[PDB]
Amino acid sequence: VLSPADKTNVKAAWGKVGAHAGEYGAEALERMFLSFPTTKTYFPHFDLSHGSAQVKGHGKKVADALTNAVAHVDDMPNALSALSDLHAHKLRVDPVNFKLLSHCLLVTLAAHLPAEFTPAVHASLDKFLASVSTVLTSKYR
Amino acid sequence: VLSPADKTNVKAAWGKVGAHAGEYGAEALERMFLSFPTTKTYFPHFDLSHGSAQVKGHGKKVADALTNAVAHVDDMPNALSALSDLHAHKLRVDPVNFKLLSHCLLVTLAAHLPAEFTPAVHASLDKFLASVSTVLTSKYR
Amino acid sequence: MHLTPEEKSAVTALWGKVNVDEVGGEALGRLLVVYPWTQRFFESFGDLSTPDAVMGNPKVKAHGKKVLGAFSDGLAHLDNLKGTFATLSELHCDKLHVDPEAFRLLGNVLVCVLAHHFGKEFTPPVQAAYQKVVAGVANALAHKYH
Amino acid sequence: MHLTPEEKSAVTALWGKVNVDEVGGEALGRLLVVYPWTQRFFESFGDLSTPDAVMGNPKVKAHGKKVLGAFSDGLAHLDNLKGTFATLSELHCDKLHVDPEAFRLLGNVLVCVLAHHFGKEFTPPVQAAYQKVVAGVANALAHKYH
Numbered sequence: 001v002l003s004p005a006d007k008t009n010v011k012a013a014w015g016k017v018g019a020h021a022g023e024y025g026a027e028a029l030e031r032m033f034l035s036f037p038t039t040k041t042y043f044p045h046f047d048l049s050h051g052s053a054q055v056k057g058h059g060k061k062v063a064d065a066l067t068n069a070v071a072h073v074d075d076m077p078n079a080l081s082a083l084s085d086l087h088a089h090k091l092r093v094d095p096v097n098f099k100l101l102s103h104c105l106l107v108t109l110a111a112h113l114p115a116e117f118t119p120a121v122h123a124s125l126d127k128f129l130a131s132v133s134t135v136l137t138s139k140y141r
Numbered sequence: 142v143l144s145p146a147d148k149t150n151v152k153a154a155w156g157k158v159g160a161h162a163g164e165y166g167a168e169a170l171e172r173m174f175l176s177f178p179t180t181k182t183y184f185p186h187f188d189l190s191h192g193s194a195q196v197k198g199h200g201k202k203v204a205d206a207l208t209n210a211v212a213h214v215d216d217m218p219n220a221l222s223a224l225s226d227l228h229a230h231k232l233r234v235d236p237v238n239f240k241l242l243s244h245c246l247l248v249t250l251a252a253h254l255p256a257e258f259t260p261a262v263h264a265s266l267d268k269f270l271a272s273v274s275t276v277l278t279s280k281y282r
Numbered sequence: 283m284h285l286t287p288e289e290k291s292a293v294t295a296l297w298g299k300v301n302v303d304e305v306g307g308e309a310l311g312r313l314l315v316v317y318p319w320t321q322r323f324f325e326s327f328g329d330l331s332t333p334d335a336v337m338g339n340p341k342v343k344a345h346g347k348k349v350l351g352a353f354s355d356g357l358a359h360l361d362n363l364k365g366t367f368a369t370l371s372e373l374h375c376d377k378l379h380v381d382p383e384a385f386r387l388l389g390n391v392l393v394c395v396l397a398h399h400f401g402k403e404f405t406p407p408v409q410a411a412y413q414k415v416v417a418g419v420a421n422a423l424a425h426k427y428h
Numbered sequence: 429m430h431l432t433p434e435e436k437s438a439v440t441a442l443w444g445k446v447n448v449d450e451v452g453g454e455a456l457g458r459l460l461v462v463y464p465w466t467q468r469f470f471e472s473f474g475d476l477s478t479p480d481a482v483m484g485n486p487k488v489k490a491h492g493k494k495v496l497g498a499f500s501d502g503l504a505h506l507d508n509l510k511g512t513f514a515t516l517s518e519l520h521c522d523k524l525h526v527d528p529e530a531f532r533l534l535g536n537v538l539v540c541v542l543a544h545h546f547g548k549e550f551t552p553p554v555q556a557a558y559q560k561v562v563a564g565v566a567n568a569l570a571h572k573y574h
């Protein structure tokens with residue numbers, strides 16, 4: 001459960017991301033595809049090449065949704081209902097995969113928000129991605 | 142989330158366990174020690190030998206808690222709060238090990254309730270164990 | 283694959299008693315039922331809406347038998363699983379796009395299936411041999427992913 | 429390892445730029461903070477009640493340096509991590525009772541620290557290669573558990 005300190009930390013950190021969230025979404029995907037090649041099984045229809053517009057676009061989409069989650073950090077389940085739906089009944093991504101993207105997201109943030117990526121902020125962001133993961137896979141069965 | 146169906150399933154299969162819960166608890170442990178030896182790192186103080194009384198004693202405690210969770214299927218977070226606190230604060234069992242135990246519990250039940258261990262019940266028991274594990278791990282960070 | 287001679291004999295002795303047709307059908311059906319997300323690979327199999335629709339689906343039964351057939355063959359080459367499974371590994375990756383985690387779920391389900399069928403015969407130690415085996419097979423099937 | 433000459437060179441080259449002192453202290457402390465349950469192994473270190481208390485704790489810092497040191501030496505035996513960590517694997521199992529999963533958590537913490545430190549320099553391709561090493565090291569260390 002996200003503590004008030006956590007919620008603050010997250011809103012701060014994400015606050016800093018700003019106009020770059022789209023780029024960071026894209027970068028996180030790229031790192032995921034390269035580090036955990038099994039994740040590519042879910043994107044056969046994409047051009048997974050570096051700088052692919054499909055990848056960029058998807059990067060934006062994910063980032064945006066994260067944004068929306070930080071904004072409704074208090075009501076995630078409700079804010080992401082549709083997305084939890086899509087994933088459980090359409091996409092059907094295996095839950096193990098959520099942890100890989102989460103990790104690539106930390107790495108990307110760390111590499112971009114040096115000053116802001118403190119030990120306390122790191123812990124919070126992780127918890128947050130974990131909560132987001134739980135929400136997205138809650139209606140799986 | 143557990144559905145009415147799931148609930149009926151669990152109560153029924155656990156219903157059948159009856160007085161063997163204890164023995165089935167001990168057997169799930171041995172199964173786990175044998176198949177996933179890394180779990181043993183948490184019981185350095187135990188005699189893990191076949192028919193160890195420590196294991197017997199422990200299997201009963203575990204079975205009692207599960208039995209307690211079934212009894213309070215509509216209020217597990219509260220029925221297990223204390224055990225949740227213990228695991229989070231003292232034991233500090235890495236989360237991954239819950240899945241290992243859950244797995245060995247399923248094998249144990251499968252091995253003992255052939256008539257009841259139907260696909261439907263199997264699915265329900267798996268969701269159940271997952272739920273218990275989530276509760277026991279909820280206060281970890 | 284750290285199968286001691288005694289673990290290997292145990293895998294093999296039990297495997298002698300298995301009806302791969304039957305077990306294949308059960309393991310695969312059960313997988314689609316416990317982890318419904320895995321149904322994403324079989325949208326052409328028809329009706330998988332309920333446990334009976336899945337367990338009884340003629341297509342699931344036939345596919346299960348195929349899968350376990352391949353697995354059985356693997357059991358005769360415990361020495362060279364990666365070699366044994368290489369073309370299949372490539373197919374699953376490149377053509378089927380099957381997330382390998384699915385191979386681990388099936389292994390666990392299969393272990394529950396063997397427990398269900400053999401009861402007491404599926405001892406703690408027999409389970410541990412089979413645990414090594416399903417893991418080795420899943421690993422072999424994921425070896426060619428890229 | 430299943431490291432490409434190119435992957436080997438990438439690992440090797442960034443490492444050359446690492447301050448093990450600083451990176452070791454930070455990786456271990458971050459671990460203790462992100463995954464609080466890993467503190468069960470360092471009771472004797474003191475007050476790890478807060479990020480600041482962990483990050484400031486000298487015992488943590490010094491243990492961190494020892495861990496990264498051994499890690500550092502393993503990068504010289506990338507073609508035999510198994511043999512490089514054999515004695516360390518037994519120790520961790522038989523004396524320390526450390527769950528191998530912690531090896532995995534640290535690994536990912538390490539990658540986060542590296543990214544943190546190197547920014548731009550720590551590219552997707554460089555991270556990919558590092559992910560293979562941390563995974564490799566963790567396997568090596570868990571290898572002798574029984």
Ligand code: HEM
Nearest residue numbers: 039042043058061062065066091093097098101102132136
């Ligand atoms: C951090 C958790 C995640 C979030 C917030 C997220 C968010 C999204 C969003 C916003 C969409 C687009 C919906 C639309 O098109 O309207 C999407 C689609 C998709 N996601 Fe998830 N995702 C997450 C995790 C994952 C993971 C880990 C995978 C696979 C490894 C994945 C696989 C997919 C796929 C394949 C699509 C559809 C792609 C397409 O055809 O455009 N997602 N996700």
Ligand code: HEM
Nearest residue numbers: 180183184202203206207224232234238239242273274277
């Ligand atoms: C759903 C799964 C689990 C349940 C229901 C459960 C329940 C319990 C209970 C009832 C106790 C005894 C507390 C007391 O002294 O009153 C206990 C203790 C303990 N459990 Fe858990 N537990 C679970 C999972 C795990 C796992 C996966 C591990 C590690 C592999 C673990 C490790 C321990 C340890 C080390 C103790 C202390 C035993 C002793 O020193 O006597 N538990 N657990």
Ligand code: HEM
Nearest residue numbers: 320323324348349350352353370378380384385388419423
């Ligand atoms: C023990 C692990 C497995 C083995 C030995 C195995 C073996 C096979 C074999 C022999 C085939 C037929 C190859 C061909 O069409 O040329 C096949 C096809 C297939 N397998 Fe696997 N399989 C395994 C696991 C899985 C799992 C766990 C899934 C998905 C959850 C899966 C999904 C598929 C699909 C979708 C096909 C093609 C079916 C079709 O004809 O439409 N396999 N597998």
Ligand code: HEM
Nearest residue numbers: 466469470494495496498499516524526530531534565569
């Ligand atoms: C990169 C992976 C790791 C490496 C290379 C490593 C290496 C080492 C080394 C070289 C020692 C020195 C002890 C001696 O020689 O007597 C040590 C001790 C120890 N390690 Fe590990 N370690 C690793 C991961 C971990 C993790 C993740 C933990 C727990 C979170 C851990 C817990 C310990 C403990 C508790 C000690 C004993 C220190 C003492 O005596 O106070 N290790 N490790």
